[PDB]
Amino acid sequence: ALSSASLAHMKAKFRETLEDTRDRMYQMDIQQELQRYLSLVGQVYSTLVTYISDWWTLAAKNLTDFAEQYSIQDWAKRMKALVEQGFTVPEIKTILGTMPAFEVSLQALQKATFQTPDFIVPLTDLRIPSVQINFKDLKNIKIPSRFSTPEFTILNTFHIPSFTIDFVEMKVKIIRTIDQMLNSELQWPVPD
Amino acid sequence: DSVVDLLSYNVQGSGETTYDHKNTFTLSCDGSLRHKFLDSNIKFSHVEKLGNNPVSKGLLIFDASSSWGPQMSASVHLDSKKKQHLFVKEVKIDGQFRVSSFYAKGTYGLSCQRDPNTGRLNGESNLRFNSSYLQGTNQITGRYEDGTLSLTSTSDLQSGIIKNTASLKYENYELTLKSDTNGKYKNFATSNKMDMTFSKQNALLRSEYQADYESLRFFSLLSGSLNSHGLELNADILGTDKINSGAHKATLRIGQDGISTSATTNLKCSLLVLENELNAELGLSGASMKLTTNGRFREHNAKFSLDGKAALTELSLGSAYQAMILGVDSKNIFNFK
């Protein structure tokens, strides 16, 4: 039933499917998929920035034209002040640290400029500063490949040293699973 | 402020909290309740150094003196320093409380000495509680030398009338827990030593118990172990006394080959003997059973047997029983295939 005259086409098609599947899972790796997702997110972010930049101008022109005929310019000015200016949260002094001042508005989001928190975790060897993040270009920003935990002491009794949690190990494990699955074909079961 | 004593009072409390950017911390929690029935004096110190030499210090001074007889006091001393690089931590906690005639005091002492260079830790703890009608005394010690833990537990229950000692061993990823509990109340010569040990596939299970009350020398044994292929377990229970004796043996074999069990029970009551034996095997070749039980009373006896063989090829069920009861020749032959 699996090796008749009409089954050679099925066998060849399944072999081709296994090869194409292997080609695809050669690509859905850890770092490959991370880079592809970040690049796609950056591209769609830039396209959305352009579209919103056009649409804000168009809507402002429409609102100005409508207000110059119905004497409702006060509401238009209120909306422009509330949207264009937004609100600027100043530097925040907390136990985690000093948060730099940031303005939430429409232009700050158009420019894609994020101030990461500048916090200092006590009893740690690694510090995380306020790193500028650009959302338009994410394929090259904050790429998790090499990560290691800092050494820390809790309750003055539990001292955990540095452990390197690195994505190359998981990528190797995934590739091994890919090879193991590809090497396994589906055939007629054995009598055992 | 008023002409009435009960109306005049004082309630106050300081909520000090200071952080210097030198990674310096300071906490003050003050409390003073000035009243006609209770004179509370609460104050707690806690200062921490988040920079170099992370010394941990904390002092609690609790002074709530009531003006009606109850006098409460307690002090907490938190000592945690970094001796050059060796970490020395000392905990001194005492709670002292009496009202008019009742006494209540439980003292505690903790000492920890850990070597981060070698992973060695030395943990020493002391417990003593004294009351008007209660005595508490416990000690705990442990030796964690980088994976090798040597835990020893012991306590003195009501001046040690009930003795409980425990021993925990975990080395090279092999857990081993040993403990004992004994009782010295009245004739209750109770003594149980529970024991349990672990491995990667097997974990031995043994336990014993002796009641030993007056003339009752009761014993029960539980013996079993676990594998990836089957579960053997054997419960052995012996209740013996001056005249009668309760003897039961439980045998349980479980494996891929078949199900085999043997619950053997015998009783001896002076002029009465009764023994209770079964053979129940359940394998792939069919169910085979055997029942063995005979009634021995004085002279009159009731000998009985029962066999069975449940197999697809053929069923073997035979029965036979005979007795001389009251001089009567009772007998049956019940065999059929």
Side-chain angles (χ1 to χ4, degrees):
Chain A
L2 300 181
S3 303
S4 178
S6 301
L7 279 298
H9 301 276
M10 183 278 288
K11 293 298 181 181
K13 287 179 180 179
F14 281 6
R15 292 298 186 271
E16 295 177 1
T17 309
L18 285 177
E19 295 294 335
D20 298 0
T21 304
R22 157 68 186 182
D23 297 0
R24 181 158 55 101
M25 47 188 54
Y26 181 80
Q27 291 295 337
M28 51 66 59
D29 298 331
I30 301 299
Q31 304 298 159
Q32 301 289 336
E33 184 181 0
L34 280 180
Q35 292 294 151
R36 179 183 56 182
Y37 282 168
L38 286 173
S39 180
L40 293 179
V41 166
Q43 283 290 336
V44 302
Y45 197 92
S46 300
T47 304
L48 184 59
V49 168
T50 56
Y51 186 82
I52 301 298
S53 300
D54 300 330
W55 186 84
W56 172 249
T57 304
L58 180 60
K61 294 179 60 59
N62 298 330
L63 185 57
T64 303
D65 296 0
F66 193 86
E68 287 179 358
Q69 298 178 359
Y70 290 87
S71 177
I72 62 176
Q73 184 70 23
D74 47 355
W75 182 82
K77 292 299 297 179
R78 289 181 180 181
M79 295 298 102
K80 289 180 181 60
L82 286 179
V83 173
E84 297 181 0
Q85 298 290 337
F87 58 94
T88 302
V89 181
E91 299 182 0
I92 301 301
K93 188 64 171 59
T94 49
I95 301 299
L96 306 181
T98 300
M99 295 298 102
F102 64 97
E103 178 181 1
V104 180
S105 57
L106 182 63
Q107 299 295 336
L109 306 180
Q110 296 307 311
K111 302 305 176 299
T113 54
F114 188 75
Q115 295 282 324
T116 52
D118 190 8
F119 60 94
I120 301 304
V121 187
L123 301 178
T124 53
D125 300 358
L126 299 183
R127 304 296 180 87
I128 301 302
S130 63
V131 179
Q132 182 58 252
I133 301 301
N134 180 24
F135 300 150
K136 296 182 177 60
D137 296 357
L138 292 176
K139 66 182 181 293
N140 306 330
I141 297 195
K142 194 190 59 182
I143 301 311
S145 297
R146 302 293 299 180
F147 193 81
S148 178
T149 60
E151 317 177 359
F152 61 94
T153 307
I154 301 299
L155 297 181
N156 304 120
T157 48
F158 302 94
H159 183 63
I160 301 300
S162 61
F163 289 92
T164 61
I165 301 307
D166 306 327
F167 305 84
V168 58
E169 302 181 1
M170 283 73 74
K171 186 174 181 178
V172 167
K173 288 299 181 300
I174 301 301
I175 297 177
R176 291 305 171 271
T177 306
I178 300 320
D179 297 4
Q180 289 293 335
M181 183 278 288
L182 182 65
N183 288 132
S184 180
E185 298 180 359
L186 182 59
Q187 301 292 336
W188 55 93
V190 298
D192 302 0
Chain B
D1 173 69
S2 180
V3 300
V4 181
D5 53 350
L6 303 179
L7 184 58
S8 297
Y9 66 90
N10 171 22
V11 183
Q12 56 179 359
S14 181
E16 181 273 348
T17 300
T18 301
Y19 178 80
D20 193 9
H21 47 71
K22 191 261 182 183
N23 313 273
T24 300
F25 162 77
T26 302
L27 173 60
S28 176
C29 302
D30 185 13
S32 181
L33 304 185
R34 307 307 305 271
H35 308 272
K36 281 69 53 177
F37 49 91
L38 170 60
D39 309 328
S40 177
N41 187 202
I42 297 176
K43 65 195 76 59
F44 173 72
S45 175
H46 186 253
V47 177
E48 298 298 331
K49 278 73 69 177
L50 310 182
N52 189 359
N53 293 330
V55 175
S56 300
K57 293 302 180 181
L59 176 58
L60 170 59
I61 301 303
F62 150 75
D63 302 324
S65 179
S66 179
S67 64
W68 296 93
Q71 311 305 331
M72 295 298 102
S73 179
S75 178
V76 179
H77 306 269
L78 306 180
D79 304 330
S80 180
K81 305 169 298 302
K82 181 180 63 61
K83 187 57 184 304
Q84 68 272 15
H85 178 89
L86 272 299
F87 299 92
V88 178
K89 180 181 301 180
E90 301 179 0
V91 180
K92 303 307 174 183
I93 297 178
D94 301 325
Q96 46 181 358
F97 316 98
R98 282 81 63 194
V99 181
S100 183
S101 58
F102 177 80
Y103 183 79
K105 174 58 183 302
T107 182
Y108 182 84
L110 180 59
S111 179
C112 178
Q113 295 293 337
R114 178 182 177 270
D115 188 12
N117 308 118
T118 56
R120 300 177 302 178
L121 191 148
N122 307 330
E124 295 78 14
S125 177
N126 171 27
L127 186 143
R128 198 279 175 279
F129 173 80
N130 180 22
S131 179
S132 299
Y133 298 90
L134 178 58
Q135 303 299 333
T137 299
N138 179 90
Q139 190 278 341
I140 301 297
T141 187
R143 296 304 306 273
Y144 178 82
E145 304 177 1
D146 196 11
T148 62
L149 177 57
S150 303
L151 177 58
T152 300
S153 176
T154 187
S155 180
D156 306 331
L157 300 176
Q158 189 63 23
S159 304
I161 301 302
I162 301 307
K163 293 308 300 174
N164 177 24
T165 56
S167 178
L168 277 296
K169 303 303 300 177
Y170 177 81
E171 285 75 18
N172 59 58
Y173 304 91
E174 295 292 330
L175 188 56
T176 300
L177 62 84
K178 304 303 133 175
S179 305
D180 169 71
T181 303
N182 306 324
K184 274 68 70 184
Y185 185 82
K186 299 295 296 181
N187 305 121
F188 298 162
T190 65
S191 179
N192 176 272
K193 187 267 184 181
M194 72 291 291
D195 47 321
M196 187 66 204
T197 302
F198 303 89
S199 175
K200 56 181 179 181
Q201 178 182 178
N202 187 268
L204 71 83
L205 176 58
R206 198 270 300 171
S207 180
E208 52 84 18
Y209 173 69
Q210 172 60 212
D212 189 11
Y213 169 74
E214 294 183 356
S215 60
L216 182 56
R217 283 84 65 193
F218 173 76
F219 173 76
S220 174
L221 179 56
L222 189 149
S223 58
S225 182
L226 59 92
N227 300 269
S228 60
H229 301 349
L231 183 63
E232 62 287 355
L233 176 61
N234 293 317
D236 293 331
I237 297 88
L238 276 297
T240 180
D241 194 75
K242 45 179 172 296
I243 297 179
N244 303 332
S245 303
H248 168 58
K249 280 70 63 181
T251 297
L252 277 297
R253 173 47 191 171
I254 297 86
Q256 300 288 328
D257 305 330
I259 297 92
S260 303
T261 175
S262 300
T264 297
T265 300
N266 174 88
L267 61 85
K268 178 67 173 66
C269 298
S270 177
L271 303 183
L272 180 61
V273 170
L274 176 60
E275 84 299 346
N276 304 327
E277 293 74 17
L278 57 91
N279 185 359
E281 194 278 338
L282 286 81
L284 302 180
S285 301
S288 178
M289 61 79 71
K290 177 56 186 59
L291 176 59
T292 304
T293 298
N294 305 326
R296 206 287 307 171
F297 175 67
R298 296 204 299 257
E299 185 271 347
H300 287 350
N301 305 329
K303 60 186 76 62
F304 178 78
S305 44
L306 183 63
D307 58 352
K309 185 265 290 182
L312 181 61
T313 63
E314 182 177 1
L315 175 62
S316 177
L317 301 179
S319 177
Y321 168 81
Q322 60 271 17
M324 73 291 291
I325 301 304
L326 266 293
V328 182
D329 187 10
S330 179
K331 190 269 293 180
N332 55 0
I333 301 300
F334 292 165
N335 302 303
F336 62 94
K337 306 305 169 185

